From a paper:
Metal-dependent formate dehydrogenases are important enzymes due to their activity of CO2 reduction to formate. The tungsten-containing [name] [name] from [name] Hildenborough is a good example displaying high activity, simple composition, and a notable structural and catalytic robustness. In these FDHs, the active site is well conserved with the metal being coordinated by four sulfur atoms from two molybdopterin guanosine dinucleotide (MGD) ligands, one labile sulfur and either a S from cysteine or a Se from selenocysteine. [name] has the great advantage of being tolerant to oxygen exposure in the oxidized state, allowing its purification and handling in air.
Crystals of the as-isolated enzyme were soaked with dithionite inside an anaerobic chamber, mimicking the conditions of the EPR titration. The resulting crystals (DvFdhAB_dith, PDBcode7Z5O) diffracted beyond 1.5 Å, and the structure was solved by molecular replacement using the formate-reduced structure (PDBcode6SDV). The model was refined to final crystallographic Rwork and Rfree values of 12.1 and 15.3%, respectively. The overall refined structure is identical to that previously determined from crystals soaked with formate, with RMSDs of 0.21 Å for 963 α-carbons (out of 978) in the catalytic subunit and 0.25 Å for 214 α-carbons (out of 236) in the small subunit. On the other hand, in both the dithionite- and formate-reduced structures, the distal MGD-2, which is believed to modulate the redox behavior of the W, suffers a distortion in the ribose moiety, when compared with the as-isolated form. Consistently, the MGD-2 conformational change is thought to be triggered by the rotamer orientation of the Gln890 side chain in the reduced state. Furthermore, analogous to formate, dithionite reduction leads to a small movement of SeCys and its corresponding loop, with Cα-SeCys192 shifting up about 1 Å and the His193 side chain moving away from the metal and being replaced by a water molecule. The adjacent α-helix (Ser194-Pro198) is also displaced up to 2.3 Å (measured at Cα-Thr196). Similar to the formate-reduced form, the catalytic metal site was refined with an occupancy of 1 and very reasonable B-factors (W = 14.9 Å2, S12/1101 = 15.0 Å2, S13/1101 = 15.6 Å2, S12/1102 = 15.1 Å2, S13/1102 = 15.1 Å2, Se = 18.9 Å2, and S = 17.5 Å2). Overall, this structure is nearly identical to the formate-reduced one previously reported, which confirms full reduction by formate.
Author numbering:
A (entry chain AAA): 36 to 861, 869 to 1006
B (entry chain BBB): 2 to 215
Write the structure that this text describes.
């Protein structure tokens, strides 16, 4: 026996940091009745096999931490100090602030006379850190209160992926999963530092290399990832589209595309209309006055039945594939080398290695994360990756995919639960003011007349109705539709997003902010602006593990508490290992985890904090009345509670959904109260509820499939690592999306040695087939209107093909590909006092703003202070020695950091001039530790663009000077 | 006995191993500062039994050779530390007969600590300034005797860390060296007949650390 673990109860959990979703084992003293005594890896978990990076490996120190919040704290207007208060006081007073602000600000109808039933006087930030059941409950609480300004982390790092990949494949999700990386023949890591930011992914990346894969890192910097790749190719900041356009040209010129896959499964054969053109860097339908395209000019030519015309011979000059060849003919090696700064020799090496995966029995994967995809053409960067993968036949196959790596443990789930201003749960859009009825809302879904096109989104009315029945079970969906707030049809959608919430706050336009599991005083771009702007709030609610730069902004650097009127409530929540629930990882694996120790001190799980808060608001409305009470009074919260507490199990069952009456669906009889077995059995007529149609199948009459810990695999499942009996992934346990594209028209795998699905004895064996139907009878992309992987993507604001528009404004004056320098549908000052390109990025040992990891002594031990990474060339220019203190400054702010002088950074050659990059970690803040430094977001701008609503944190102008 | 095979050609310098060693033993954190390096703590100490050493080497063309070295006691087959300590008092340094772990006891306070560090060919032992006890990696010998992997081996994401019976680990080291030479032609094993922690280096071991090999 090990004394340390004797007498302790062992439970399982899932890491609370990144989206890999590593398994933990937690030992809790006194057979579960005391504190955690140990936290380490779960040896049985199929993703990590017991491995943990330093963040997972230190979760014991995060949880058993005497700096954690212990009880609610209250800061009165103009006060110098916190006062400790009861949960009863804090939640009672917060409910009064919510009700006072809502009653004063609630709008039934907008200026135009359209029903909107909303309050614009309260905003919410957060959070991908909450469990899936908590995220789902939180969004429904905020929407029942009438909020529209509902945002979180996903806006920055997830939001560009969803439309890029949805345009290309029909869904926004990461297409494959972590274990599947070991099946790749060539791994291209580009806009990702996965060895530092998804460290257990390198278990599977290095296993691919063991079986003969080539590993390629394309990054402006040499990182811990680069050290373990076969090829490191430097790229200039923002030169990704030229790099990827050059690879498209290389694939087409050298005939390395997967011909049969391209003909059958992509839109290569579709005939584009005569109104499509591209000239001088502009597509047809450009409106120069409004800086916008008439996308109707990009329509397909339709047959007599309304279906896009196809030429399967691919000879018609207006075939997608022929327009594609013409578009990318400009991306020659000489021009691509000049702009990327990558040598022609290295471009040829990378292109040859990667394009070799166009062979049917080879697979290539692309791994990207946040990288620099935040700028106005980040969607087109991701489109280009999707197009390359479709040309090479890498979508739907083992070791293939677009592995768009999610950031946080539950950013997949928090997005799935609609914690962004434009979406309800399950990616049903938030209604705008012109969607006056449920019938009009449903009318917007595009239809297909192609009998081979599944067009699965035609089922949307079932999902919206079942969602409204989960919230308001005693109302007809058409009546409950009027309870939920609507955004203005006449406003830019970005007016409701992250950056404009900070801008409105700075204009004094919010009374209240929820900072729920986020640190916006460090995570928001232009921290000096945002910290000042928080002083313009009447009230702030911060729900968090520790006191932090947001909770305590009023006593931050340069702040006089006696001049700051903001009322602040600090509500301490419990850590992941102190509560039960699920988190959805980057591969869509929805994993159940259990309580080890009880909540520390008087901390509470988020579900209890939000439900108690909402019950107090509801009580106030029952006693006082006020603005439109129906959405609050009628919300179904009885299904969220058991034994006087928030119930993760009951909320997960509601999110799956259940029958409200005896129902015949899909030729099967279901009884009142039965769990819905899959979203295929939801109805639009009120017979079913489901909080999230993507969850229908996760928690059935068979039990909690998210809690399965079964390693059982068939030989074909085990060969590629599907682990279909370990947890559950949406949709309906399809581990590899688009897997009908992995077989020929008879159901035979392109790569039998790595089969995903195979037609055997009248059924699909292996993975769950992504779309039912006999081989050769359906188009493989079932969430696409037309059924095909889109090379040509005419729903994108910037055009149907990616095109280089320069994202680096200050040092670049010339575009070698066209007369159009900058994005024609998209204010940088470029003050010559700030000649260097500042960038922010992560290190393995710290998490996000560092609020969590700056409280962990072993992680501070390894990375104690903010640093500034510079080249030998810049160090020589500015007289900076390794380890010197430097001042980094911008138009927005200034900070001190320790210089790290390294050959891992080299100058960029731009138009015959060396341009220097300055690297900073954004993991530091004034609260802790001693001499740690403050946020790199003191330096960053807050401009964004009218299309993304995302600030520039990867290329912003700075100066660096030695401090003596 | 037992053996570690440490394939440095797979290391991402994640420092999972550095943290896992301290979590298992509940060791304190040192006071550290950044002096122009990711490396920290800068050295082994009484409270740090493992630290990842970082070395940058220039190469022709893009990037660098970035060398990572998770340093620990080699658990020598014939340990000079024990031969030195035994001059002053037997029992201060002992060897587990089944695993081969070399173990410092509380009796290290009663010997010439500085002399024991000096006897070590790898410069491993560290002295507590207050109590004069010596510390170093103990092979997680209690975990090993209970059928568990050492904390640093279990945590490692990359397959850098490997542990088992000496026969299976020497066979693994031989097989892996032949494969790694296809990528790193100058790869060598560190003192493989003398120690129980056998590092595979991708080049001259002294490029990783002055005391990488004897
Ligand atoms: N250790 C750790 N892991 C994390 C996090 C953390 O804080 N710490 N955060 C998590 C979260 S929330 C997220 S969103 C993810 C983000 O994960 P990543 O996107 O991997 O994060 P970064 O390190 O910010 O950026 C990745 C790389 O992009 C490179 N890059 C910069 N500009 C360009 C460019 O123009 N082109 C290309 N091709 N590359 C460029 C940078 O040099 C950097 O190495 O990480 C997650 N994982
Ligand atoms: N300059 C710059 N800025 C950036 C980025 C960048 O690359 N550069 N990255 C952006 C991105 S991608 C992201 S993801 C954001 C992240 O920005 P934030 O989310 O604001 O960062 P943190 O607050 O550090 O994230 C961890 C938080 O999780 C909370 N937490 C942990 N467990 C729980 C729990 O159970 N409940 C609750 N309620 N809270 C919990 C902690 O208290 C802490 O506040 O920063 C963005 N900002
Ligand atoms: S931070 Fe990510 S890679 Fe590290 S232990 Fe946690 S889930 Fe695994
Ligand atoms: S074997 Fe145990 S004591 Fe030695 S370095 Fe690894 S974790 Fe630390
Ligand atoms: S490495 Fe040094 S301290 Fe460790 S066993 Fe050998 S002589 Fe003793
Ligand atoms: S845990 Fe493994 S990969 Fe990470 S630094 Fe240690 S030996 Fe290297
Ligand atoms: S995230
Ligand atoms: W993120």
């Amino acid at each position: 026996e090990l004394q340390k673990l004797q007498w302790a109860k062992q439970t399982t959990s899932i890491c609370c940091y990144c989206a890999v979703g590593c398994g933990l084992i937690v030992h809790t003293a006194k057979d579960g009745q005391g504190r955690a005594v140990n936290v380490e890896g779960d040896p049985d978990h199929p993703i990590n096999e017991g491995s943990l990076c330093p963040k997972g490996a230190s979760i014991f120190q995060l949880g058993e931490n005497d700096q954690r919040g212990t009880q609610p704290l209250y800061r009165a207007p103009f006060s110098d100090t916190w006062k400790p208060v009861t949960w009863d006081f804090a939640l009672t007073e917060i409910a009064k602030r919510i009700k006072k602000t809502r009653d004063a600000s609630f709008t039934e109808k907008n200026a135009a006379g359209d029903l909107v039933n909303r309050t614009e006087a309260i905003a919410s930030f957060g959070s991908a850190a909450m469990d899936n059941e908590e995220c789902w409950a939180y969004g429904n609480i905020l929407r029942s209160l009438g909020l529209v300004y509902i945002e979180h982390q996903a806006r920055i790092x997830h939001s560009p992926t969803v439309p890029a990949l949805a345009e290309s494949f029909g869904r926004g999700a990461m297409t494959n999963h972590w274990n599947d990386l070991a099946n790749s023949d060539c791994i291209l890591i580009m806009g990702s530092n996965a060895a530092e930011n998804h460290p257990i992914a390198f278990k599977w990346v290095l296993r691919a290399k063991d079986k003969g894969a080539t590993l390629i890192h394309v990054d402006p910097r040499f990182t811990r990832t680069s050290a373990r790749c076969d090829v490191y190719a430097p790229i200039r900041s923002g030169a990704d589209i030229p790099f990827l356009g050059g690879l498209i040209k290389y694939i087409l010129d050298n005939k390395l595309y997967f011909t049969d896959y391209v003909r059958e499964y992509t839109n290569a054969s579709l005939i584009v209309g005569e109104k499509f053109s591209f000239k001088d860097g502009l597509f047809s339908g450009y409106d120069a006055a409004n800086k916008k395209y008439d996308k109707s000019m990009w329509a397909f030519e339709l047959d007599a039945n309304g279906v896009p015309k196809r030429d399967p011979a691919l000879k018609h000059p207006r075939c997608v594939i022929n327009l594609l060849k013409k578009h990318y003919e400009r991306y020659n090696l000489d021009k691509v080398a000049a702009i990327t700064g990558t040598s022609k020799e290295q471009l040829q090496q990378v292109y040859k290695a990667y394009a070799a995966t166009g062979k049917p029995d080879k697979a290539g994967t692309i791994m990207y994360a946040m990288g620099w995809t935040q700028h106005s053409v980040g969607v087109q960067n991701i489109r280009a990756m999707a197009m390359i993968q479709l040309l090479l036949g890498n979508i739907g196959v083992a070791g293939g995919g677009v592995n768009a790596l999610r950031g946080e443990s539950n950013v997949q789930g928090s997005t799935d639960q609609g914690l962004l201003a434009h979406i309800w749960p399950g990616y049903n859009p938030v209604p705008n003011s012109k969607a006056a009825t449920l019938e009009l809302y449903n009318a917007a879904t595009p239809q297909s007349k192609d009998p081979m096109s599944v067009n699965w989104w035609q089922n949307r009315p079932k999902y919206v109705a079942s969602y409204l029945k989960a919230l308001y079970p005693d109302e007809e969906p058409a009546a409950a539709y009027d309870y939920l707030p609507r955004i203005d049809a006449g406003r830019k959608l970005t007016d409701y997003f992250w950056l404009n919430i900070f801008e409105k706050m700075d204009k004094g336009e919010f009374k209240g902010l929820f900072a729920w599991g986020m640190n916006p005083a460090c995570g928001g771009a232009n921290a000096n602006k945002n910290r000042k702007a928080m002083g313009k709030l009447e009230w702030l609610v911060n729900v968090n593990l520790f006191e932090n730069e947001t909770s305590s902004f009023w006593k931050g650097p340069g702040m006089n508490p006696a001049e700051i009127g903001t009322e602040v409530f600090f509500l301490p929540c419990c850590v992941s290992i102190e509560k039960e629930g699920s988190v959805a990882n980057s591969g869509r694996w929805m994993q159940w985890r259990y309580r080890g120790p009880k909540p520390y001190a008087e901390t509470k799980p988020d579900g209890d904090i939000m439900l108690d808060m909402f019950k107090k608001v509801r009580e106030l409305y029952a006693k006082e009345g006020g603005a439109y009470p129906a959405p609050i009074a009628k919300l179904n919260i009885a299904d969220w509670e058991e034994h006087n507490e928030f119930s993760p199990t009951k909320v997960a069952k509601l999110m799956n959904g259940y029958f409200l009456k005896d129902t015949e669906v899909g030729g099967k009889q279901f009884k009142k109260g039965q769990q819905v077995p899959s979203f295929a059995f939801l109805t639009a007529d009120g017979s079913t509820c489901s909080g999230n149609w993507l969850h229908a199948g996760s928690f059935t009459d068979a039990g909690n499939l998210m809690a399965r810990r079964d390693k059982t695999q068939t030989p074909e499942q085990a060969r590629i690592g599907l682990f279909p009996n370990w947890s559950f992934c949406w949709p309906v346990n399809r581990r590899i999306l688009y897997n009908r594209a992995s077989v020929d028209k008879t159901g035979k795998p392109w790569n039998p040695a790595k089969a995903v699905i195979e037609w055997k004895d009248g059924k699909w064996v292996g993975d769950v087939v992504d779309g039912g139907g006999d081989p050769g009878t359906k188009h493989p992309f079932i969430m696409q209107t037309h059924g095909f992987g889109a090379l040509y993507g005419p729903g994108r604001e910037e055009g149907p093909f990616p095109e280089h528009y320069e994202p680096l404004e200050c040092p670049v004056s010339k575009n070698p590909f066209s007369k159009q320098l900058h994005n024609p549908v998209a204010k940088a000052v470029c003050d010559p006092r700030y000649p260097f390109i500042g960038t922010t990025y992560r290190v393995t040992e710290h998490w996000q703003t560092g609020l969590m990891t700056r409280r962990c002594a072993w992680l501070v031990e390894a990375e104690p202070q903010i640093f500034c990474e510079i080249s030998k060339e810049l160090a020589k220019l500015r007289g900076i020695g390794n380890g010197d203190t430097v001042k980094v400054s911008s138009l927005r702010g200034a900070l001190e950091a320790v210089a790290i002088v390294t050959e891992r950074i080299r100058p960029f050659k731009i138009e015959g001039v060396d341009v220097h990059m300055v690297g900073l970690p954004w993991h530091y803040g004034w609260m802790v530790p001693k001499n740690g430094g403050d946020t790199a977001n003191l330096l960053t701008p807050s401009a964004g663009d009218p299309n993304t609503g995302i600030p520039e944190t990867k290329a912003f102008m700075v100066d660096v000077r030695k401090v003596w | 006995g037992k053996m570690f095979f440490v394939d440095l050609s797979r290391c991402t310098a994640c420092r999972g191993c550095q943290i896992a060693c301290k979590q298992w033993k509940n060791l304190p954190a040192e006071e550290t500062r950044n002096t122009g390096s990711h490396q920290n703590p800068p050295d082994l100490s009484y409270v740090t039994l493992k630290t990842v050493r970082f070395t940058e080497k220039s190469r022709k063309g893009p990037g660098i050779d970035w060398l990572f070295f998770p340093e620990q006691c080699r658990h020598c087959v014939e340990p000079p530390c024990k031969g030195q300590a035994d001059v002053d008092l037997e029992g201060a340094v002992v060897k587990d007969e089944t695993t081969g772990a070399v173990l410092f006891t509380e009796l290290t306070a009663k010997v010439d600590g500085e002399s024991v560090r000096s006897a070590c060919p790898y410069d491993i032992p560290r002295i507590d300034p207050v109590t004069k006890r010596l510390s170093k990696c103990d092979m997680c010998n209690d975990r090993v005797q209970n059928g568990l992997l050492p904390a640093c081996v279990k945590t490692c994401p990359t397959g850098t860390m490997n542990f088992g019976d000496e026969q299976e680990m020497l066979a693994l080291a031989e097989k892996r060296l032949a494969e790694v030479k296809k990528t790193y032609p100058g790869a060598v094993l560190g003192d493989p007949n003398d120690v129980r922690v056998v590092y595979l280096f991708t080049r001259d071991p002294k490029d990783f650390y002055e005391h990488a090999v004897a």
